[PDB]
Symmetry: C2
Subunit: 140 residues, 2 copies
Amino acid sequence: FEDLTNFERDNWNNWQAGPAGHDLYLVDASTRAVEFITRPNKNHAGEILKKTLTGLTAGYEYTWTVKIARIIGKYEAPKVSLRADGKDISAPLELKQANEWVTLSGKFKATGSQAELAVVSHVSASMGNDFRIKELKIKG
Amino acid sequence: PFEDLTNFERDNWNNWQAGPAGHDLYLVDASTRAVEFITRPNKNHAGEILKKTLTGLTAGYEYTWTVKIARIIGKYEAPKVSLRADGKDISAPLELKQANEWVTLSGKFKATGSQAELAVVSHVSASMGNDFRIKELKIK
Ligand SMILES: C[Se][C@@H]1O[C@@H](C)[C@@H](O)[C@@H](O)[C@@H]1O
Ligand SMILES: C[Se][C@@H]1O[C@@H](C)[C@@H](O)[C@@H](O)[C@@H]1O
Ligand SMILES: [Ca+2]
Ligand SMILES: [Ca+2]
């Protein structure tokens, strides 16, 4: 079960002002994100973000979540997966609606104190293939 | 418990790097939609400020309610907020003193039927200050 209200598309998801909530309205706050604009005539398929995550313990399963959204929404849709220690730990997720923030998730099992993580693009195209990543989180 | 969190606040990439297929990466301010509480003059802003009749629950289960909130502007009175469910206080009042610092209110409640009555609570009636935004509410 999960009931998530982020107010995208001005959907209040049945939340209402209470008696003490006066003159409520929605605004655009801001959150920092890496932008992937994929310029012309470069190959944008492969590992697009990399990190050697330290502080792990062998045999534990860690959960990697990435908050990601397509932008612009024109031409080719991005397709993004997660990789850990060379192993694909998620299916390729196609990003479709512009500025709809979704979670890309995978789990991996550490073999030691660190793991080599990579976010992977499966679309080499520059026409479209535009998206943003605002958060990468690993929990265990 | 392990957590490695990168949200790029203050442009901290937290040891994430562009991969070979990550061309011309940069940070941007992406939008994130939020309810603004500007608390106008000569109204009482203490009490239940946002509420929802949450459906689809199964009686007896323990649900955890999260709310991402931040003071803004930071002048005059500081907000103070908590969570309430079925008329019961499930979180301690927390003073949001740091402007633009996003914090997560969290509380647990067990359902009493098909639905639950949830309310975010303000403990500051003042209009002088007492300004904040809520960008996300989540129950799971
Ligand atoms: C018409 Se410019 C072409 O399409 C845009 C939607 C972007 O993907 C841009 O990077 C690309 O060069
Ligand atoms: C100087 Se106008 C006074 O203080 C501002 C910081 C806001 O809290 C506004 O709602 C209030 O009326
Ligand atoms: Ca592009
Ligand atoms: Ca105010």
